[PDB]
UniProtKB/Swiss-Prot annotation, chain A:
It comes from Escherichia coli (strain K12). One of its GO terms (molecular function) is structural constituent of ribosome. This is Large ribosomal subunit protein bL34. The gene is rpmH. One of its GO terms (cellular component) is cytosolic large ribosomal subunit. NCBIfam families: rpmH_bact.
UniProtKB/Swiss-Prot annotation, chain B:
One of its GO terms (molecular function) is RNA binding. Belongs to the universal ribosomal protein uL2 family. One of the primary rRNA binding proteins. Located near the base of the L1 stalk, it is probably also mobile. Required for association of the 30S and 50S subunits to form the 70S ribosome, for tRNA binding and peptide bond formation. It has been suggested to have peptidyltransferase activity; this is highly controversial. In the E.coli 70S ribosome in the initiation state it has been modeled to make several contacts with the 16S rRNA (forming bridge B7b, PubMed:12809609); these contacts are broken in the model with bound EF-G. GO terms for cellular component: cytoplasm; cytosol; cytosolic large ribosomal subunit; DnaA-L2 complex. This is Large ribosomal subunit protein uL2. It comes from Escherichia coli (strain K12). The modification N6-acetyllysine is found at residue 241. Residues 27-52, 220-271 are annotated as: Disordered. Keywords: Acetylation, Ribonucleoprotein, Ribosomal protein, RNA-binding, rRNA-binding. One of its GO terms (biological process) is cytoplasmic translation. The keyword Ion transport does not apply. Part of the 50S ribosomal subunit. Forms a bridge to the 30S subunit in the 70S ribosome, contacting the 16S rRNA. Interacts weakly with S6 in one of the 3.5 A resolved structures. In pull-down experiments interacts with CedA. The keyword Nucleus does not apply. Changing residue 229 to Q: Loss of peptidyltransferase activity in reconstituted ribosomes. No change in rRNA binding or assembly into ribosomes.
Length: 46, 271
RNA sequence: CUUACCACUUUGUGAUUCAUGACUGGGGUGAAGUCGUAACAAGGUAACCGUAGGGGAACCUGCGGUUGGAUCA
RNA sequence: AGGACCGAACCGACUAAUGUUGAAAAAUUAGCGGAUGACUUGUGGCUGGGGGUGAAAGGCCAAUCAAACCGGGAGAUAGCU
RNA sequence: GCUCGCCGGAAGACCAAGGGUUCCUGUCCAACGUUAAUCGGGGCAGGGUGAGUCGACCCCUAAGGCGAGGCCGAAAGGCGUAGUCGAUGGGAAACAGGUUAAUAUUCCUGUACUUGGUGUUACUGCGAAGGGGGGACGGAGAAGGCUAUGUUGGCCGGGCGACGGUUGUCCCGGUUUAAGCGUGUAGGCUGGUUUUCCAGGCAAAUCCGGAAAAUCAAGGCUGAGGCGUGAUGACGAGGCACUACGGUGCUGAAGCAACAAAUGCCCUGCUUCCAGGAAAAGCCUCUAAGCAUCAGGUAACAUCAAAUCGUACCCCAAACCGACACAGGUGGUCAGGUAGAGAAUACCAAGGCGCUUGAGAGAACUCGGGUGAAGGAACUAGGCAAAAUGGUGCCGUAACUUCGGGAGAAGGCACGCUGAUAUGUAGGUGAGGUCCCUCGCGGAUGGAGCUGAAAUCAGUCGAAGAUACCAGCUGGCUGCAACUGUUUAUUAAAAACACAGCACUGUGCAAACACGAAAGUGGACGUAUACGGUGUGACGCCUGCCCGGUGCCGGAAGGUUAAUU
RNA sequence: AAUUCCUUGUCGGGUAAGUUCCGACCUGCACGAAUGGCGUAAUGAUGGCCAGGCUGUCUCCACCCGAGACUCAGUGAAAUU
RNA sequence: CUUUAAUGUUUGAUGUUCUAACGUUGACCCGUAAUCCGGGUUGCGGACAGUGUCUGGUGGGUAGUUUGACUGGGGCGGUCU
């Protein structure tokens, strides 16, 4: 029945978005983490 | 009046309402209300602090004013209103100064009566007055913890306090809980018993009452598993343990009362 | 031929009545069994009425009332 | 009036049959319960792991729960196969 | 292209979420469509989403987040004032036709509207981060009025009919038309106005709140729809001319009335109830500092400005969530005809479809069904499953009971159609006429026409008339649990949890307690008729004896006793 | 008895026959008064027993209409080994 | 000088009274058109309360673990020198 994934751009971003990302200590670490690993799309860009 | 309820349907055959028709039927004095916002007994971190709490109706706070300054200036009880925030029955007033205010509204609160408040005032239900003035052994009313603090005693309905005695700057009174307390005396306290009094009759009836009243159900201890409550365990009710709060505390003994910074203003404890 | 009324008779569901039934409540009779002695004398705690509770049992005890109570109270 | 009655939408999930390499990692069909209420739903928010939440089953906490998931300590240890 | 069949409160139409070119045209068929494929949501190309008025920005704030300084904390950080963000909610304005292959309240026609700046004129006290009002708010129910819209008649166009009949009482179709402007009505609410005085609204205020008089009362807000104008316009059946055969140009009749309706509107109304029912800005008003021939304010009109993003298409699905072109999941809006209580249902309309393997054959057996002699639960753990029952009205209905119920108990009877009553009644609706008048969407009295149930008679066809779909099986004895509810998402819905009620116990407020190292915070803007914890679990009759052991409450004189000295 | 081991206790009722059911007795292995006792109208997709109607549940299956099953053509799996 | 009593003096035991640390989630003022914060004023309380170090009690709220072997399956029982 109802799956486990109900999309919502607004939420998707403010939840795992570069903004809310650069909002916490370990957040900017999560990024830098990828930035080091040379990730393609840092965190759900658009 | 209390008024029972016809067994018209289940969960209504027991209902025992309480109607005070003399209570305003329209909306409240808007310029004396201000949001409320339910809390659900949650903390600042969303962590539920006090169990059983939520739902209920909207509930908008009034104003009351347990201070009762506006001295010398009298006023006539404009109307009588119903208050969700408290058990008592709030009441308008309107001073001759032209300002409107609220009051718990005591026993004799007949709409149209007059009331004052001040060193002089007048020993009468409604008129606020500093015990340093009011007689001894009076029924009093909304007492005041500290001098001018705002009054926080006998606020509930049917409540009241007896000025047992006075000794200098302090006045020894008797709280409804049956405790011999003391106060700075220089604390306003008005007069008369708080209205309603017949409040302790509501039967509610159906569970909904409590629920839509802003109260969630309660889960018993010997009903849940160990990991969830000291009263855990199963396989056939059982117990063989000491009645303790969900944190291991004899809910039948102890006392917890550990202030020592107030004992001073205490004579005979609640018995 | 047909319709209407209606007898027998059919069905469902109550009411009343008599009989009857595992068992059981208490009530009546029964020479001589047991347990105690409550009442009639001041009956050995004066008795009884109503009422309430308690008790193997008569009964006891509490509350009010009555005299249909003994003494020279 | 009513946690009132019958009954769609709507919410739910008592029975049986079928499916069981399904149409489907719980559904389909014929019945079934609630249906102005402790109702039901959209949108956004707050509770973070020995912690949350729980009308209490150890139930839910992203198909995962008697302690989630991801990475690290880490080639844990494995008188066993 | 002609049939046939299926959906049609949808399997239709539009939209949000989400998707992100899937849209359209032309092409191509390898791989992708569970087949073939000339076809496609596939490949390759181009083309295609045009706004002052729709939405997002944008003002305003809710939850909640963030947070100068600040208060805390080994660090990281936690919290929070001012304040700043944050819609799912409040603030301003566009309608009707036409058009594209594909755009549409964006482009074209016509007819409007909002706000701001600048100007001309008339009049005037303007002036806030400030005061006041207003925005601005619950549940349920009960009407009436209105429209949507349907039905019928008229009117207009067309039609005389593959087979008996059909030019008059006949068949087919259409009958539409918005914003805005004026009117301000069914109805809802409320008495106005002047003057004076004042311990209130942090200052002030003419505003609001309070107090006096005086004077009139027909005042003042509000508000569906109707009616005009819009509109001699558009649209409009249909013809006439053309076609690449998809589709084109031109032309154009009638276009009214009655009745019936809504879950929509009047209605943020009205009545009533307890569980007592956002905030802030826009807005109106009042003053403050300031200004003080000024500036501004108000109205009329003229003019300029109205930026920028979004706008294709799917959207109960083959474009979203489910690995699939998957019988699952997915919020909002619209709501025709017959019959019906109705968004059930059955057949249909507009609209959309036949589900991307087909052709035969007519075996056992599996799956879904239809019917069965006689019997009728002998089946079986068990009546599992089936079968049965089913409607409206009326008659009538038990123990028991908390007097509400139990109760649709049970058990019956009538139901179609036709004529009469009555050429269509009772009712509903309400046109002239006529009366008068505050006075017109006036009132009265008229009852034409329109619409129209039930009943009672008599007759009549079938085996059967609640003929389909649809649509309770009933009763008796007894365990458990008061009852509605809740629960093991994916084997357990129960006798479990919960609940109203009860009792014990803690808590005097900086409460008890809980989250937190802390600051702080919930409890609660509550205060013992309150809040927490525990156990029991409606209600009725009740709830015995035990304090030795453990815990808990009170005492602490004495015995023993930590650090320390 | 949702508590009874012996246990299908015994007796009565229902039956043609009743280890279930209902009413009793008390010899309560091992009920009992808010980890409440006994009742209790109404309520229940709740447990047990019975009855009327009903019937393919069964005696005992038969016929019939469809979806596979089989034949043809296209595509074209799986477990296991 | 010792056995012992008034004076002073010292120091402990409690018990009052005081203010000046310390608290105030009383009332104002200012920072400030603020509810936090800070400073000031006043009132209340007041060396108490509270906290730090040390220390007795309590402490399944929490945490790390233990909880033997033989055994004609294991357990029970018995055994282990
Ligand atoms: N039957 C009379 C009622 O019951 C009771 O009376 C009954 C008993 O009390 C009384 O029984 C008595 C007994 O009390 C006394 N201590 C011993 C005496 N033998 C018994 O007597 C009884 O049993 C014997 C058997 O032997 C018979 O013969 C005799 O008739 C019979 N009455 O005999 C009566 C039975 O008939 C009340 N006391 C009386 O007031 C009441 O009205
Ligand atoms: Mg359990
Ligand atoms: Mg525990
Ligand atoms: Mg368990
Ligand atoms: Mg005697
Ligand atoms: Mg006596
Ligand atoms: Mg209901
Ligand atoms: Mg179903
Ligand atoms: Mg229902
Ligand atoms: Mg959500
Ligand atoms: Mg899961
Ligand atoms: Mg290591
Ligand atoms: Mg390894
Ligand atoms: Mg593409
Ligand atoms: Mg296409
Ligand atoms: Mg394509
Ligand atoms: Mg913060
Ligand atoms: Mg903002
Ligand atoms: Mg919004
Ligand atoms: Mg012919
Ligand atoms: Mg579009
Ligand atoms: Mg389109
Ligand atoms: Mg397909
Ligand atoms: Mg047969
Ligand atoms: Mg049988
Ligand atoms: Mg069945
Ligand atoms: Mg059936
Ligand atoms: Mg039984
Ligand atoms: Mg129940
Ligand atoms: Mg239920
Ligand atoms: Mg399950
Ligand atoms: Mg289930
Ligand atoms: Mg219980
Ligand atoms: Mg119980
Ligand atoms: Mg029995
Ligand atoms: Mg007891
Ligand atoms: Mg039988
Ligand atoms: Mg083949
Ligand atoms: Mg442990
Ligand atoms: Mg270890």
């Amino acid at each position: 029945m109802k799956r486990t994934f109900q999309p919502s751009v607004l939420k998707r971003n403010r939840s795992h978005g570069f903004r809310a990302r650069m909002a916490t200590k370990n957040g900017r670490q999560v990024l830098a983490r990828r930035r080091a690993k040379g990730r393609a799309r840092l965190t759900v860009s658009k | 009046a209390v008024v029972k309820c016809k067994p018209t349907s289940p969960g209504r055959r027991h209902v025992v309402k309480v109607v005070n028709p003399e209570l305003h039927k329209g909306k409240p004095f808007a310029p004396l209300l201000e949001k409320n916002s339910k809390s659900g007994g949650r903390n600042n971190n969303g962590r539920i602090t006090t169990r059983h709490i939520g739902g209920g109706h909207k509930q908008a706070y009034r104003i009351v004013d347990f201070k009762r300054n506006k001295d010398g200036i009298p006023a006539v009880v404009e109307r009588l209103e119903y208050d969700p925030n408290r058990s008592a029955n709030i009441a308008l007033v309107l001073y001759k100064d032209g300002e409107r205010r609220y009051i718990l509204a005591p026993k004799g609160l007949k709409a149209g009566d007059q009331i004052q408040s001040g060193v002089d005032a007048a020993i009468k239900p409604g008129n606020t007055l500093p015990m340093r003035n009011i007689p001894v052994g009076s029924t009093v009313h909304n007492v005041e913890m500290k001098p001018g603090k705002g009054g926080q005693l006998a606020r509930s309905a049917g409540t009241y306090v007896q000025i047992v005695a006075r000794d200098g700057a302090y006045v020894t009174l008797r709280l409804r809980s049956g405790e011999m307390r003391k106060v700075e005396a220089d604390c306003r306290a008005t007069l008369g018993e708080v209205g309603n009094a017949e409040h302790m009759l509501r039967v509610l009836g159906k569970a909904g009452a409590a629920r839509w009243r802003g109260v969630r159900p309660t889960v018993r201890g010997t009903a849940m598993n160990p990991v969830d409550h000291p009263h855990g365990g199963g396989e056939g009710r059982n117990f063989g343990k000491h009645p303790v709060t969900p944190w291991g505390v004899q809910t039948k003994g102890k006392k917890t009362r550990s202030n020592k910074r107030t004992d001073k203003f205490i004579v005979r404890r609640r018995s």
